[PDB]
Design a protein around this ligand. Structure first.
Ligand SMILES: CC(C)=CCOc1cccc2c1-c1c(c3c(n1C(C)C)CCCC3=O)C2=O
Ligand SMILES: [Cl-]
Ligand SMILES: [Cl-]
Ligand SMILES: [Cl-]
Ligand SMILES: [Cl-]
Ligand SMILES: [Cl-]
Length: 332
């Protein structure tokens, strides 16, 4: 008797009901454009797997953004392209415009529609209480959408959110780690950045689902309302789970482990030890007092749960009272 199986609470079969070509990205044949249509203007930034440029389409003189992919497995390029194509046109999802390949070096590059925005990590430590709620809600729109389309983002973090703060616009970017959810499928746990990895990743439970993204969202919320960047500041992968356990307590962690019959590393179990749960108000200070409300703490508590199946879905989050006034002014 190994680990207990798990299934997503919502959107479980959305890919099952789709035609195979929707999610079988390996069979998909990529129709590449002409790189000559694009000339690079200047550098915008650089990820771990890409270099990002401002560019111009010399066929309609439109501004675009080009993301030149650093060499990874060809299977990962088709997955990212297929996911971006499936999500194209969704609320707050970056819009893929074209796919091009270098004539000589054969390096693939993604072409996106240009939006004069800035990175969320440069803003999210200075927002008003209402602005935290507002942009959290826009992030949730993107996550509920992509989850409803059968896709887990798996790398939700401040650096992967873009803000056009003058137009109050938001985009969820970097779909290079995203995957299609299929019930019963076992997934790789080497996803997400350390500070935003869910406990299922840290204990090597492979049958996870969309709820992984909700843990990452909870880490972002905690960082914003408490002004602690990151909130769980683990120094290696084991220490990341220790930091979590020093907050949520070890009791609910071991219940989670036992619930899914997860075999933990012998020395790891002794590493975790015993820690009581800390009240969320223990992290409130005089300088983040204006950002912390009872509804904020109740919402955060309902995202940061060890048991991935107990976390709020994206739609349940959007109906949490924490967004009540945000939702009311969404009608103007
Ligand atoms: C205005 C500033 C500060 C940057 C413009 O950042 C943009 C703009 C439009 C579209 C994208 C990015 C961007 C993307 C991506 C990244 N960046 C940034 C962080 C360079 C990081 C690597 C992964 C990725 O995918 C991406 O798709
Ligand atoms: Cl980040
Ligand atoms: Cl599998
Ligand atoms: Cl995977
Ligand atoms: Cl910490
Ligand atoms: Cl969801």
């Amino acid at each position: 008797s190994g680990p207990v199986p798990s299934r997503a609470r919502v959107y479980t079969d959305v890919n099952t009901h789709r035609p195979r070509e929707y999610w079988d990205y390996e069979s998909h044949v990529v129709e590449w454009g002409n790189q000559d249509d694009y000339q690079l203007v200047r550098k915008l930034g650089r990820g771990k797997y890409s270099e990002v440029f401002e560019a111009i389409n010399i066929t309609n003189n439109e501004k675009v953004v080009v993301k030149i992919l650093k060499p990874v497995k060809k299977k990962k390029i088709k997955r990212e392209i297929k996911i971006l194509e499936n999500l194209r046109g969704g609320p707050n999802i970056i819009t893929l415009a074209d796919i091009v390949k270098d004539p000589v070096s054969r390096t693939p590059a993604l072409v996106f529609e240009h939006v004069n925005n800035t990175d969320f990590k440069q803003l999210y430590q200075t927002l008003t209480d209402y602005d935290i709620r507002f942009y959290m809600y826009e992030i949730l729109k993107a996550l509920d959408y992509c989850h409803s389309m059968g896709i887990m983002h798996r790398d939700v973090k401040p650096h992967n959110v873009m803000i056009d703060h003058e137009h109050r616009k938001l985009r969820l970017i970097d779909w290079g780690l995203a995957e299609f959810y299929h019930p019963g499928q076992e997934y790789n746990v080497r996803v997400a950045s350390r500070y935003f990895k869910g406990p299922e990743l840290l204990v090597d439970y492979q049958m996870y689902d969309y709820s992984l993204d909700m843990w990452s969202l909870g880490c972002m919320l905690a960082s914003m309302i408490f002004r602690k960047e990151p909130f769980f500041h683990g120094h290696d992968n084991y220490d990341q789970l220790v930091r979590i356990a020093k907050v949520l307590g070890t009791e609910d962690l071991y219940d989670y482990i036992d619930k899914y019959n997860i075999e933990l590393d012998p020395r790891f179990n002794d590493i975790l030890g015993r820690h009581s749960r800390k009240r969320w108000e223990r992290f409130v200070h005089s300088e983040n007092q204006h950002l912390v409300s009872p509804e904020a703490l109740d919402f955060l508590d309902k995202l940061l749960r060890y048991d991935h199946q107990s976390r709020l879905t994206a739609r349940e989050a959007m109906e949490h009272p924490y967004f009540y006034t945000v939702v009311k002014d969404q009608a103007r």
